[PDB]
C-alpha cells in the first residue's frame, strides 16, 4: 500500500504523488497529521457556517484557528508532529464547543463530529480521509484544487490579521468553501463554480493584505538594495511577515547586530518605514531552495516567519529559529501568530556569538514597482507603449524551486528582445533579477512589485492599462504570462487571475499533478492555459 499520499506542490514524485516520503522531506506520519488536521478544519468550517445561518455569532478566534491550521499544512511550513497533533486536539475541542451551541445538529458530517486526543487514533483516521478518499477523478481534482487555493488565501488573510485587518465576508467564505469540499451532493459544475469563486475571494484576500502592508509601512517605492554584506554579526529574516521584521528591527536598535533579508523578505526594503533603521542591511542570497548552502554561509542566526523552510543541516540547525505557524522538531520557536509582542532577546544574544556573514556576491538590485509607484509612472509607461519603445510586457511572477528545468526561466529572460519589460513578484524573480538586462527609456527591464501577494499590484496595473487604452478585454493588452509555480500561494494567485478573465497563461515548469484530464480540458478550452517547452521555441511561439 502507500504510507502517504501528497501531491500539492510542483516537485511531487513523478508529477503524480509522493507515496513513501515527500521530496520536501515530509515524513509519512507528518503527512498523516496534516491530512487529519485538514479534515477536522473542514468539519469546523461546516459547524461555523451552520451557526452563521442560525443567526449565531462565531468569534474571530475561530477564524484564526482555521487560517493557522491551513497555513501550517502549506509546503515547507511545519514538519513538527507534536505541534501538528496539538492543533488537531485544539480543533476538535473548538468544534465540539461550537456544535453544542447549534440548535439543530442534523446533517453534520463525520468531519464535524469525529474527535481524537491520542496521536495513534489521529494517524489511523488520517489513513481514510486523505486525497484518495474521493474516488471520482474530477471531484477529487476540484476538491483539492479548491483546498490548495484556500490554503494560499488563508496565508494572505493571516498576514492581514497580524496587522489588524480582517473581513467577516472573507473568513465566512473560507469556512463555507471548506465545508463544501466534504459535501458529496455537489456536482462537477458546482465545484467548477466554487473554483472560480475561490479565485474571486483570492483577489479579496490579496487586496486586504495590500491595504494592511501599505497602510502600516507605506507604499513601496523605487529602491536600490545592497546584496553584499557588512562586518557586524547579523540575523537573517526569511519568509513573508513584515510585522515580525518591524519588531526585530526595533529590538536590534543599539545592539550592534545587523538585520538582513532572505528570499520573500526582499520586498521589505521597498517600504519607506523600514528605511529609517540604519542597521537594516541588504538582501542575502537567492530563493528558498538554496538555503542549505546560503544559511550555512550567512554564519549568524536565521528566523523563518513563514514557509519555505527546508529540513536543516546539522551545521546550522542550532541557529534556526521558527515563529508563527512554522515548525521543525529540534529547532527553537518564538511563540506568536497574531502579531503580538515577540521577544527576540535570545536570537540577538546568539547573533553576537557568531561570525559576520560570508559574502556571496556584491552590487545591488532595484525594485519597489508596486501599484502606487507604477500608477505614478503610468503616463510615461503608456507613452512608451504608444511609441513602440515597449513592445510587450512579460509577467514572470510566481515561485522558484529546485528543478534543473527552471534554467528555462533564466534563459527565457536573457533571450527576450530588448524592447520587452519583465513584471515580477514572488521568489520566481531570483532566476533573472541578477542578470544585466538594462532599461527602456529609463524604465528598468525587470520591474519587481514585491512578494507573491504583490501579484495583486500586477493585476491592478493591468486593469489600469485596460482602462486608459479603452479596451473591452484585458487580454488585448500587450502582455504575455509565463508564470512559475511551486506551492499553494501560487495556486491562489492563478485562480485569482482566472477569476479576473486572464487567458493564455503559460504555467511551469510542469502542470500540477492535481489537475485531472477533464479539469485540465476545461482550463485549456475556456482559459487557454498551456505549459513550457524550450526557451528558444517559446521565445518564438509565445509572441
Ligand atoms: S508538499 Fe510537495 S514534495 Fe512535500 S510531500 Fe507534498 S507533493 Fe511531495
Ligand atoms: Fe511568496 S513565493 Fe512560492 S516558493 Fe517558498 S518562499 Fe517562494
Is residue 442 left, alpha or beta, with left meaning phi > 0 and alpha meaning psi from -120 to 50?
left
- The set of cell numbers assigned to 173 is 467564505
CA distance linking residue 266 with residue 477, whole number of Å: 29
CA distance linking residue 53 with residue 61, whole number of Å: 19
The gap between the terminal CA atoms of the chain, to the nearest Å, is 47
CA distance linking residue 367 with residue 266, whole number of Å: 9
CA 430 centroid distance within chain: 16
Which residues line the annotated binding site for [4Fe-4S] cluster? 6, 9, 18, 24
Where is the chain discontinuous (C–N over 2.5 Å), named by the preceding residue? none
Q: Nearest C-alpha to atom 1 of ligand 1 is from which residue? A: 75
Pocket test for ligand 2, best of 240, 487, 490, 493 (most atoms within 8 A of CB): 487
| Contact (Cβ atoms closer than 8 angstroms) between residue 389 and residue 443 | no
**Ligand located closest to 290 CA:** 2
- The residues with which 304 forms a beta bridge, in sequence order, are 238, 322
How large is the greatest C-alpha to C-alpha distance in the chain, in angstroms? 68
- The set of cell numbers assigned to 14 is 513523478
- The set of cell numbers assigned to 19 is 507515496
Listed in order, the ranges of the chain carrying CATH 3.40.50.2030 are 225-375, 378-543
CA distance linking residue 233 with residue 240, whole number of Å: 22
| Contact (Cβ atoms closer than 8 angstroms) between residue 274 and residue 249 | yes
| Contact (Cβ atoms closer than 8 angstroms) between residue 58 and residue 148 | no
Residue 254 burial (CB count, 10 A): 7
- The residues with which 462 forms a beta bridge, in sequence order, are none
Calculate the alpha carbon distances from 30 to 56, 84, 144, 523, 531 in Å.
Answer: 35, 8, 19, 32, 32
- Helix, strand, coil percentages in the chain from 3-state DSSP, rounded to 5: 50, 10, 40
- Cβ–ligand 2 distance for 209 under 6 Å, the answer no
CA distance linking residue 12 with residue 18, whole number of Å: 6
Residue entry with cell 519555505: 308
Pocket test for ligand 1, best of 20, 30, 75, 308 (most atoms within 8 A of CB): 75
| Cβ-proximal residues to 373 (8 Å cutoff; 6+ apart), any chain | 219, 220, 221, 222
Instruction: Tell me how far the alpha carbon of residue 15 lies from the centroid of ligand 2, in angstroms.
Output: 19
Alpha helices in 105-224 (DSSP H): 110-113, 119-126, 137-162, 168-180, 188-217
Q: Is the dihedral of CA 242, 445, 289, 458 positive or negative?
A: positive
Torsion (CA) 513, 517, 520, 526 in degrees, nearest 10: 180
CA distance linking residue 475 with residue 504, whole number of Å: 8
- The set of cell numbers assigned to 432 is 533573472
CA distance linking residue 320 with residue 307, whole number of Å: 13
CA distance linking residue 510 with residue 290, whole number of Å: 20
Pocket test for ligand 1, best of 26, 126, 489 (most atoms within 8 A of CB): 26
- Cβ–ligand 2 distance for 249 under 6 Å, the answer no
Whether the upstream peptide bond of residue 393 has omega within 30° of 0, thus cis, is: no
The H or E element containing residue 515 is: none
CA distance linking residue 49 with residue 464, whole number of Å: 36
Residue entry with cell 521565445: 539
- The residues with which 238 forms a beta bridge, in sequence order, are 304
Atom of ligand 2 nearest to the CA of 401: 4
| Cβ-proximal residues to 359 (8 Å cutoff; 6+ apart), any chain | 228, 229
| CATH number for domain 1-139, candidates 3.40.50.1970, 1.20.1270.20, 2.40.160.20, 2.40.10.340 | 1.20.1270.20
Q: Nearest C-alpha to atom 5 of ligand 1 is from which residue? A: 22
Classified as helix, coil or strand, 433 is coil
CATH code reported for the domain at 140-223: 1.20.1270.20
Pocket test for ligand 2, best of 149, 288, 454 (most atoms within 8 A of CB): 288
Q: What is the DSSP string of 440-504?
A: ETTEESEEE--SGGGHHHHHHHHHHHHHHHT-S-GGGSSEEEEEE--SHHHHHHHHHHHHTT---
Listed in order, the ranges of the chain carrying CATH 1.20.1270.20 are 1-139, 140-223
Q: Nearest C-alpha to atom 6 of ligand 1 is from which residue? A: 6
- Cβ–ligand 2 distance for 454 under 6 Å, the answer no
Instruction: Tell me how far the alpha carbon of residue 302 lies from the centroid of ligand 2, in angstroms.
Output: 17
- The residues with which 247 forms a beta bridge, in sequence order, are none
CA distance linking residue 292 with residue 324, whole number of Å: 21
Q: Nearest C-alpha to atom 6 of ligand 2 is from which residue? A: 308
Q: What architecture is domain 225-375?
A: 3-Layer(aba) Sandwich (3.40)
Residue 418 burial (CB count, 10 A): 10
- Cβ–ligand 2 distance for 264 under 6 Å, the answer yes
**Ligand located closest to 9 CA:** 1
- Cβ–ligand 2 distance for 399 under 6 Å, the answer yes
Atom of ligand 1 nearest to the CA of 22: 5
Phi, psi of 95 (to 5 degrees): -75, -30
Is residue 529 left, alpha or beta, with left meaning phi > 0 and alpha meaning psi from -120 to 50?
beta
Radius of gyration of the chain measured on its C-alpha atoms: 23
Residue entry with cell 462537477: 188
- The set of cell numbers assigned to 226 is 545592497
The 3 state secondary structure assigned to 289-348 is: HHHHHHHHHHCCCEEECCCCCCCCCCCCHHHEEEECCCECCCCEEECCCCCCCCCCHHHH
CA distance linking residue 267 with residue 453, whole number of Å: 11
Q: What architecture is domain 378-543?
A: 3-Layer(aba) Sandwich (3.40)
| Contact (Cβ atoms closer than 8 angstroms) between residue 244 and residue 305 | yes
Q: What is the DSSP string of 86-118?
A: HHHHHHHHHHHHHHTT-S--TT--HHHH---SS
Phi, psi of 97 (to 5 degrees): -60, -45
Amino acid at each position: 500500500s502507500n504510507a502517504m499520499f501528497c501531491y500539492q506542490c510542483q516537485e511531487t514524485v513523478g508529477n503524480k504523488g509522493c507515496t513513501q516520503v515527500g521530496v520536501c522531506g515530509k515524513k509519512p506520519e507528518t503527512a498523516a497529521l496534516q491530512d487529519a488536521l485538514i479534515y477536522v478544519t473542514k468539519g469546523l468550517g461546516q459547524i461555523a457556517t451552520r451557526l452563521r445561518a442560525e443567526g449565531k455569532a462565531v468569534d474571530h478566534r475561530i477564524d484564526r484557528l482555521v487560517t493557522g491550521n491551513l497555513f501550517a499544512t502549506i509546503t515547507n511550513a511545519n514538519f513538527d508532529d507534536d505541534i501538528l497533533a496539538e492543533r488537531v486536539r485544539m480543533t476538535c475541542a473548538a468544534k465540539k464547543e461550537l456544535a453544542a451551541s447549534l440548535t439543530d445538529k442534523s446533517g453534520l458530517s463525520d468531519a464535524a463530529l469525529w474527535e481524537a486526543s491520542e496521536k495513534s487514533a489521529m494517524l489511523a483516521k488520517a489513513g481514510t480521509v486523505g486525497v484518495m478518499a474521493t474516488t471520482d477523478d474530477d471531484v477529487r481534482s476540484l476538491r483539492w484544487l479548491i483546498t490548495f487555493g484556500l490554503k494560499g488565501m488563508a496565508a494572505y488573510a493571516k498576514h492581514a490579521d497580524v496587522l489588524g485587518k480582517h473581513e467577516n465576508s472573507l473568513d465566512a467564505f473560507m469556512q463555507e468553501a471548506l465545508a463544501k469540499t466534504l459535501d458529496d451532493s455537489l456536482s462537477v459544475a458546482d465545484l467548477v463554480a466554487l473554483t472560480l469563486e475561490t479565485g474571486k475571494f483570492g483577489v479579496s484576500a490579496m487586496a486586504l493584505l495590500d491595504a494592511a502592508n501599505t497602510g502600516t509601512y507605506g507604499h513601496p517605492e523605487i529602491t536600490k538594495v545592497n546584496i553584499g554584506v557588512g562586518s557586524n554579526p547579523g540575523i537573517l529574516i526569511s519568509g513573508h511577515d513584515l510585522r515580525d521584521l518591524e519588531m526585530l528591527l526595533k529590538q536590534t536598535e543599539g545592539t550592534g547586530v545587523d538585520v538582513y533579508t532572505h528570499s520573500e523578505m526582499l520586498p521589505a526594503h521597498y517600504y519607506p518605514a523600514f528605511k529609517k533603521y540604519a542597521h537594516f542591511k541588504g538582501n542575502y542570497g537567492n530563493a528558498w531552495w538554496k538555503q542549505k548552502e546560503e544559511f550555512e554561509s550567512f554564519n549568524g542566526p536565521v528566523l523563518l516567519t513563514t514557509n519555505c523552510l527546508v529540513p536543516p543541516k546539522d551545521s546550522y540547525k542550532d541557529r534556526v529559529y521558527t515563529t508563527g505557524i512554522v515548525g521543525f522538531t529540534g529547532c527553537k520557536h518564538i511563540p506568536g501568530e497574531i502579531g503580538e509582542h515577540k521577544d527576540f532577546s535570545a536570537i540577538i544574544a546568539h547573533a553576537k556569538t557568531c561570525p559576520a556573514p560570508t559574502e556571496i556576491e556584491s552590487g545591488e538590485i532595484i525594485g519597489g514597482f508596486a501599484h502606487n509607484q507604477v500608477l505614478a509612472l503610468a503616463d510615461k509607461v503608456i507613452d512608451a507603449v504608444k511609441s513602440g519603445a515597449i513592445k510587450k510586457f512579460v509577467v514572470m511572477a510566481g515561485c522558484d524551486g529546485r528543478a534543473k528545468s527552471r534554467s528555462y526561466y533564466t534563459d527565457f529572460a536573457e533571450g527576450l528582445p530588448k524592447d520587452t519589460v519583465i513584471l515580477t513578484a514572488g521568489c520566481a524573480k531570483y532566476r533573472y533579477n541578477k542578470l544585466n538586462l538594462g532599461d527602456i527609456g529609463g524604465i528598468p527591464r525587470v520591474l519587481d512589485a514585491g512578494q507573491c501577494n504583490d501579484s495583486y499590484s500586477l493585476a491592478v496595473i493591468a486593469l489600469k492599462l485596460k482602462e486608459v487604452f479603452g479596451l473591452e478585454d484585458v487580454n488585448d493588452l500587450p502582455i504575455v504570462y509565463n508564470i512559475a509555480w511551486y506551492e499553494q500561494k501560487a495556486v491562489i494567485v492563478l485562480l485569482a487571475l482566472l477569476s479576473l478573465g486572464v487567458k493564455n497563461i503559460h504555467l511551469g515548469p510542469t502542470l500540477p499533478a492535481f489537475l485531472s484530464p477533464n479539469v485540465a480540458k476545461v482550463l485549456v478550452e475556456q482559459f487557454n492555459i498551456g505549459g513550457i517547452t524550450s526557451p528558444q521555441d517559446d521565445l518564438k511561439a509565445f509572441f
